[PDB]
Swiss-Prot record:
It is found in: Nucleus. Multidomain protein that acts as a key epigenetic regulator by bridging DNA methylation and chromatin modification. Specifically recognizes and binds hemimethylated DNA at replication forks via its YDG domain and recruits DNMT1 methyltransferase to ensure faithful propagation of the DNA methylation patterns through DNA replication. The lineage of its organism: Eukaryota, Metazoa, Chordata, Craniata, Vertebrata. Interacts with DNMT3A and DNMT3B. Interacts with DNMT1; the interaction is direct. Interacts with USP7; leading to its deubiquitination. Interacts with HDAC1, but not with HDAC2. Interacts with BLTP3A. Interacts with PML. Interacts with EHMT2. Binds hemimethylated CpG containing oligonucleotides. Interacts with PRAMEL7. Interacts with ZNF263; recruited to the SIX3 promoter along with other proteins involved in chromatin modification and transcriptional corepression where it contributes to transcriptional repression. Interacts with UHRF2. Interacts with FANCD2. Expressed in thymus, testis, spleen and lung. Within testis, expressed in almost all cells except elongated spermatids. This is E3 ubiquitin-protein ligase UHRF1. Residues 12-163 form the YDG domain. It comes from Mus musculus. The record marks 72 as: Required to confer preferential recognition of cytosine over thymine. There is a cross-link at residue 127 (Glycyl lysine isopeptide (Lys-Gly) (interchain with G-Cter in SUMO2)).
Amino acid sequence: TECTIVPANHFGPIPGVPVGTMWRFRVQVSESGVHRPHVAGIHGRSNDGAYSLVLAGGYEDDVDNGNYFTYTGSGGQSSDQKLTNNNRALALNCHSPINEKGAEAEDWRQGKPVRVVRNMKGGKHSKYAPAEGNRYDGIYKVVKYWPERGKSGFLVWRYLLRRDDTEPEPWTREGKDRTRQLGLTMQYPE
């Protein structure tokens, strides 16, 4: 059943789903409303913004630093990516006018929020990935985005996101203490 407590185009935290929430399977992640697409790694609308993303490995030039991370858009390498569809959505989140050249946020915190989920498949490059399942790590914002052409010569769209959430990161001592207070357990299908 699709999440109905908030609309599909809801920006920001999902009511009742705290930072640190864990689900074994993507279908539960979707049903919770935190990341609606079952398979795709980003949810957005090209004229509104990006609502959520799942970090599951992605590309080799991406680096996960926990409180911040870099990220690569979709499409294309055999052809150029374009600042359309979800690449555009994510760029629109940045506190800056949309720019085919890339842009940096004026005040990054005034950007539209992005719900970030880390999935265990990211553990092959990131020490922040959960060992199992999927974990909601809170709200991040787009600090900047830019195009680049790597070894294939084709263009990819790149993003830097930084955490802006009042609850601590689940991997920290403070996060672990919140997980305890909230009684968070790996969630399974009922």
